[PDB]
Amino acid sequence: GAVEVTEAALVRDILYVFQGIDGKHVKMSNADNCYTVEGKANLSKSLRDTAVRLAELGWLHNKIRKYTDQRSLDRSFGLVGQSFCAALHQELREYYRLL
Amino acid sequence: TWQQSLELTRKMLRDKQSKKNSGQRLPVLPAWVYERPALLGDFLPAVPIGSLPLASQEAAVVEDLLYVLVGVDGRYISAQPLTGRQGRTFLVDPNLDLSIREL
Structure with missing residues (x-):
C-alpha cells in the first residue's frame, strides 16, 4: 500500500518547514529555494497545492534567517545594522510564537 | 585542556603579583578548589530514541x-x-529524527 501522509503528519512537516527545517515527506528543494513535497509519498493534488502554498512561507522564513545570520557576523556593519537585525529577530520570534 | 593553561596563567599572575608586592602575603585559594572537577560549574565528563514514537521522541x-x-x-x-577553551560540544543520538536533531 502506497504511503499517503496524514493531515496531521503533513501539518507537522509543514510546520517544520515554517520553522526553517525540512519535514519527513516535504523537503526544501534548493533548486527553487522552496519546499517541495516528495513524490515518493502519494498525496492528492489539493494537498500538494496547499503544501506548496505553505512552503512559500518557509522560503520567506529561510530568506530572513539567512539575512540575519549574514549581517550578524560583520562587526563592520555597525550599530545601526545590528539594531536592524535585532528588530528582525524580534519579529521572527513573534512569528515563532505564533508557530 | 583549558584547565592546565589557566593554571599556568594563574601561576604567572601570582609570580607577578608577588614581584610587585615586595613579598607581602597574597591570598591563595586552597588547592582542592582548582583540583576538583566535581565543583566545576560546567559539565562533568536509556532507550534508543529512534524506536520511540515521534511524540515520544519529542518527550x-x-x-x-x-x-x-x-x-x-x-x-x-x-x-x-x-x-x-571552547563552548561545550554535544553528541546527539543518531537514531533521533533529523528534524528533531536540527531543532
Missing part, C-alpha cells in the same frame, strides 16, 4: 534537553568533552 528529547540546559547529560543527548 525524551525534551527531557534530555532540560538536563542539558543546566550542564547535565541526557539519556539520548550526550556532551562531548572539550579541548582548549
